[PDB]
């Protein structure tokens, strides 16, 4: 009944932050609860992945253990090939004000480059954020779906992608793409993040903040979904949403008196599986959110 002001709520958060950064295995135990909730959701078959488990879709899933929930999967309606199904390993992640703020998805496969672009198109996606390298752990983790300077135009079904510009920056690149489809030409902005903040090194978290701030300089609102992907579309994909989300609350003076990263992630994992893969990412989210709050003083 007696509401407290934003700042004060940040101070409550900051005050705690101190002891928590100490509380033994606090983060470990915290994250261990996330896995638990998932295990219970899978035991009760609460969130079906039937569509993604159909035979014809197996070739469209990069990892067998990462399957999009049915009720929150991005359905592909745009038909261009007598062989275009509706499936795609991706989910809608709700935003601070409503559904479809994000499209957490995997790195497209050679066999899903078409479906990828259908999606981006059908939902007028303006921003695409790639949070990974094409090559990691000695192997390929994402297929080429964008176009690079002086490289003409790659073709996926009826889509034409050419790279008009490519503003390289500190830790990421901004490819200004032009996609053609049935006489229509749209501009998509891809934010390729090759590096990843250093778990315990507070200084290394700044680059990731720069990205979202940059990303948000291109699309302040939530009119259209923001596509965010990694190899699997769970871990790093999940770190970006949460921080952007939290940041969105902070940018509008609406951080719930009882805000917590654990709860924000808990809720996100109900929309997309394995969102925020490990303890390290969990902690990164927490540390990054903390840095933001400190910056509000």
């Amino acid at each position: 009944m007696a509401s407290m002001d934003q700042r004060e709520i940040l101070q409550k958060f900051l005050d705690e932050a101190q002891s928590k950064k100490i509380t033994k295995e606090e983060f470990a135990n915290e994250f261990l609860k996330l896995k638990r909730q998932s295990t219970k959701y899978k035991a009760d078959k609460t969130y079906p992945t039937t569509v993604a488990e159909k035979p014809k879709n197996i070739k469209k899933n990069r990892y067998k253990d990462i399957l999009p929930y049915d009720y929150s999967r991005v359905e592909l309606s745009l038909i261009t090939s007598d062989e275009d199904s509706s499936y795609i390993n991706a989910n809608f992640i709700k935003g601070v004000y409503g559904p479809k703020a994000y499209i957490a998805t995997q790195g497209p496969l050679s066999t899903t480059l078409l479906d990828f672009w259908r999606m981006i198109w059908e939902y007028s996606v303006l921003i695409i954020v790639m949070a990974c390298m094409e090559y990691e752990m000695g192997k390929k983790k994402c297929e080429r779906y964008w176009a690079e300077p002086g490289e003409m135009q790659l073709e996926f079904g009826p889509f034409s992608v050419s790279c008009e510009a490519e503003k390289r920056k500190s830790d990421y690149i901004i490819r200004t793409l032009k996609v053609k489809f049935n006489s229509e030409t749209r501009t998509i902005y891809q934010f390729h993040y090759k590096n990843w903040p250093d778990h315990d090194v507070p200084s290394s978290i700044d680059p990731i903040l720069e990205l979202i701030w940059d990303v948000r300089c291109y699309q302040e609102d939530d009119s259209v979904p923001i596509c965010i992907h990694s190899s699997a579309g769970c871990g790093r994909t999940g770190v970006i949403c949460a921080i952007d989300y939290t940041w969105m609350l902070l940018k509008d003076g609406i951080i719930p008196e009882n805000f917590s990263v654990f709860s924000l992630i808990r809720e996100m994992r109900t929309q997309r599986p394995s969102l925020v893969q490990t303890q390290e990412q969990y902690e990164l989210v927490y540390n990054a959110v903390l840095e933001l709050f400190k910056r509000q003083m």
Binding site: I58, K64, D65
Partner: peptide, 9 residues
């Protein structure tokens, strides 16, 4: 390709 994103990677 399908090979556990969790199983290490």
């Amino acid at each position: 390709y399908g090979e556990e994103y969790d199983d290490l990677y």
